[PDB]
């Protein structure tokens, strides 16, 4: 019998219960966006998780938005371009979380979000 840990394993929604994705595995998830005709975009943050500081009415949370890294990569056909930008963020913000999101211009919404980098030490 193992006890589920109570610390050190805060989560980032989809795919964050998997072992951290290798470069190969990340590339395949970005390729899924491209094949789906969804637009990749990077976000980053120094704060990893949801909280409630400014209001606490139903459906209001803080920390849902992170900060956009540059612009959505419209017309990206090469997953390696996305992974390269992840390294650029890591370079400029060594202790930031980075996630990859995806925009569906057909149902007009954000439709993907998954963690690409977590600072170790966190």
């Amino acid at each position: 019998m193992q006890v589920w840990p109570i610390e050190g394993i805060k989560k980032f929604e989809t795919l964050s219960y998997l072992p951290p994705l290798s470069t190969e595995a990340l590339l395949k998830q970005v390729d899924y966006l491209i094949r789906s005709k969804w637009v990749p975009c990077l976000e980053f943050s120094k704060v990893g998780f949801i909280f409630r500081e400014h209001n606490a009415s139903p459906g209001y949370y803080d920390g849902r938005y992170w900060t956009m890294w540059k612009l959505p990569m419209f017309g990206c056909t090469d997953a390696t371009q996305v992974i390269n930008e992840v390294e650029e963020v890591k370079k400029e913000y060594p202790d930031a979380y980075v996630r990859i999101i995806g925009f569906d211009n057909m149902r007009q919404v954000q439709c993907v979000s998954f963690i690409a980098f977590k600072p170790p030490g966190c």
Partner: protein
């Protein structure tokens, strides 16, 4: 007779109904179909002088088409058209009263089932619809790219409110998005609702603070009266929690619509449970198909709706799941879609699969419903040999492994067992779940 009008061109404002009609011996389909039309509209046994004070033709239901049912020599689908003016705006209650209020007792019929309704845009635009709907819900909860996961707390009755909330915290902290109140759990001697709401709120906020992900518990607002139902939603609102629940068939459509409006006005998600549906929707020859009850819910309003287990007929389920989620659904008899249905941008409802499912079902469920679904366990979390939090983690891991594999281009229908087996190598929680439940 005069109510069978096979040359009638349906109007884009008509409500259309497809009835599966089983007439008594000696009753041809045409007067059975015409009787359905007249009996669910203007038909009355003797003539009356007040008919001459109006133009009855304008309010006649018409049977405009009849087709045989495959495998039956005494069953037909009869299509009936009802004018827009018959119906009170914004009232599912009146729509059912007008269409299914009387005709199911007609003596010339052995049995009658309502299979489908064409809800025209002119009529559906008079309804609020879902308080939020699929897209808004994903944005509010910050949850993308996978089915949502839930667990129903058991035993439904037995626990103190505190022990109940304990089980909720342990499920949520292990990786489920939601926990749920059993349909029977409203307010009862050993667990009064307000106590349950306080302890479940403590649990929601403890698990959210621990994991960093948004959590909820479907707090059941179903009650004996409208005043009590709303008192329950008002306290959920005070507590700031994200979602409440209603049993829409046993509470009823007038109450449901009231609650859907309250939830829109106050930012609450609304989880809909379909208790009692099989009293109405089970038998193929009599009653109403669930796709009718599903359309009615989308109109009255809910953000989730229980939609089965798919573990009935695949094609029929896929059919009404589209009717629940999509903006435009083309007629498709193989999938039980009798009418083209255009929702003119009314939000969709998230279908919820529940009932006896465990980790080995995850590939099939993910493949059937795709991302916009809630997979609801209840036995498959609380039955894990290491307890609730590991049971939740096992389900969350299995799901994310299936999603990762699917996104990579792997076929979930053929490779699901291998996908799950590969995840067991690095997830001891999943490995443990996989040896208790077997396939």
């Amino acid at each position: 007779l005069t109510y069978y009008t096979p040359e009638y061109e349906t109007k884009d404002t008509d409500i259309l109904a497809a009835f599966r009609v089983s007439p008594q011996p000696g009753v041809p389909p045409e007067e059975a179909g015409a009787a359905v039309a007249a009996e669910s509209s203007t038909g009355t046994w003797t003539t009356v002088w007040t008919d001459g004070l109006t133009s009855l033709d304008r309010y006649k239901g018409r049977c405009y088409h009849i087709e045989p049912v495959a495998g039956e020599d005494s069953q037909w689908i009869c299509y009936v058209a009802y004018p827009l003016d018959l119906f009170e705006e914004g009232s599912v209650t009146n729509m059912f009263t007008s269409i299914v209020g009387n005709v199911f007792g007609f003596k010339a019929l052995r049995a009658l089932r309502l299979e489908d309704l064409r809800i025209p845009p002119t009529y559906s635009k008079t309804f609020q619809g879902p308080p939020h709907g699929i897209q808004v819900e994903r944005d509010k909860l910050n949850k993308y790219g996978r089915p949502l996961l839930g667990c129903t707390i058991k035993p439904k009755l037995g626990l103190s409110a505190k022990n109940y909330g304990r089980a909720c915290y342990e499920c949520l902290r292990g990786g489920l998005d939601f926990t749920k109140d059993d349909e029977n759990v409203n307010s009862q001697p050993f667990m009064r609702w307000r106590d349950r709401f306080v302890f479940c709120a403590e649990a929601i906020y403890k698990s959210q603070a621990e994991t960093g992900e948004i959590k909820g518990h479907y707090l059941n607002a179903t009650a004996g009266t409208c005043e009590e139902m709303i008192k329950r939603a008002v306290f959920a609102r005070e507590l700031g929690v994200p979602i409440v629940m209603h049993d829409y068939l046993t509470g009823g459509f007038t109450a449901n619509t009231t609650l859907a409006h309250y939830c829109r006005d106050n930012g609450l998600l609304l989880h809909i449970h379909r208790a009692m549906h099989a009293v109405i929707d089970r038998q193929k020859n009599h009653g109403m198909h669930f796709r009718v009850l599903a359309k009615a819910l989308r109109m009255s309003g809910g953000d989730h709706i229980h939609s089965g287990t798919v573990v009935g007929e695949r094609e029929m389920t896929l059919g009404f799941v589209d009717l629940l989620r999509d903006d435009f659904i083309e007629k498709d008899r193989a999938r039980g879609i009798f009418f083209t249905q255009d929702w003119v941008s009314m939000p969709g409802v998230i279908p919820v699969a529940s009932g006896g499912i465990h980790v080995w079902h995850m590939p099939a469920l993910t493949e059937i419903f795709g991302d916009d679904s809630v997979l609801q366990f209840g036995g498959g979390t609380l039955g894990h040999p290491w307890g609730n939090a590991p049971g939740a983690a096992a389900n969350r891991v299995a799901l994310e492994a299936c999603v990762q594999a699917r996104n990579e281009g792997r076929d979930l229908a053929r490779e699901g067992n291998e996908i799950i087996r590969a995840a067991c190598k690095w997830s001891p929680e999943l490995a443990a779940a996989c040896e208790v439940w077997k396939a």
